[PDB]
Amino acid sequence: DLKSLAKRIYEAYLKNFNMNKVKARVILSGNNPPFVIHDMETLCMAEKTLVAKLVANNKEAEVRIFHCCQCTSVETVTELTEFAKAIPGFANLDLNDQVTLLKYGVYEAIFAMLSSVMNKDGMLVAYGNGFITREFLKSLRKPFCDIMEPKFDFAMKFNALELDDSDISLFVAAIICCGDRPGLLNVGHIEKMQEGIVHVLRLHLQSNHPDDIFLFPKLLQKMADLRQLVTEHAQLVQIIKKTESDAALHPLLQEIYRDMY
């Protein structure tokens, strides 16, 4: 029954995401050591080693960084789509509703999972092979210095919940299976799928975190916080699109943001 649904969702998470919290923690603790990006010199060194093709010819450092941000998001959306297709029940949905659920859910899920590669000083990037500092990102020229800091702020509080990958996989499934997204065709069926996943999440947190009797409502609130974080992020991305000609937006991300909020 429900312990099995939880395990199936956790197995789908482990298969489909290149990064998980165990992997990240092994790297962040200190083969393939992460190259630390803390200033312009180390950014340019890291680019030559980790994204060589991007700098083989150059556009401002901030625009190159934002391009790497979007490349990461494109990869994570692909992982999230596979994960979703492995969520028991998702594939029975109307294809239009599958699209809608992913459209509104991917960035909430992205920023939730980003917490796993963040600490108070910085974040893992480039498949675990770079660590870019929080202070360096703050140092970038406006508006690019305003992208990541709200995500670090969310992450520091999210990480203090001490979730593990078995919790996070269910949380991400609950983010995706959300029946109040705009434009859904079969709201009733999606709400029932959501109720099923949230019930499994509730029972799992009771078992896995008997020490924190409010953990489930804390996570319902984090879901609401993420929706607000995404609304704000999309507004910033629109400012960048309109005022930064060199910072082209990738077509999959344009499709996601278009008509979102």
Added chain:
Amino acid sequence: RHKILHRLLQ
């Protein structure tokens, strides 16, 4: 309207 997503979903 979401051709890349729709493709990814298949």
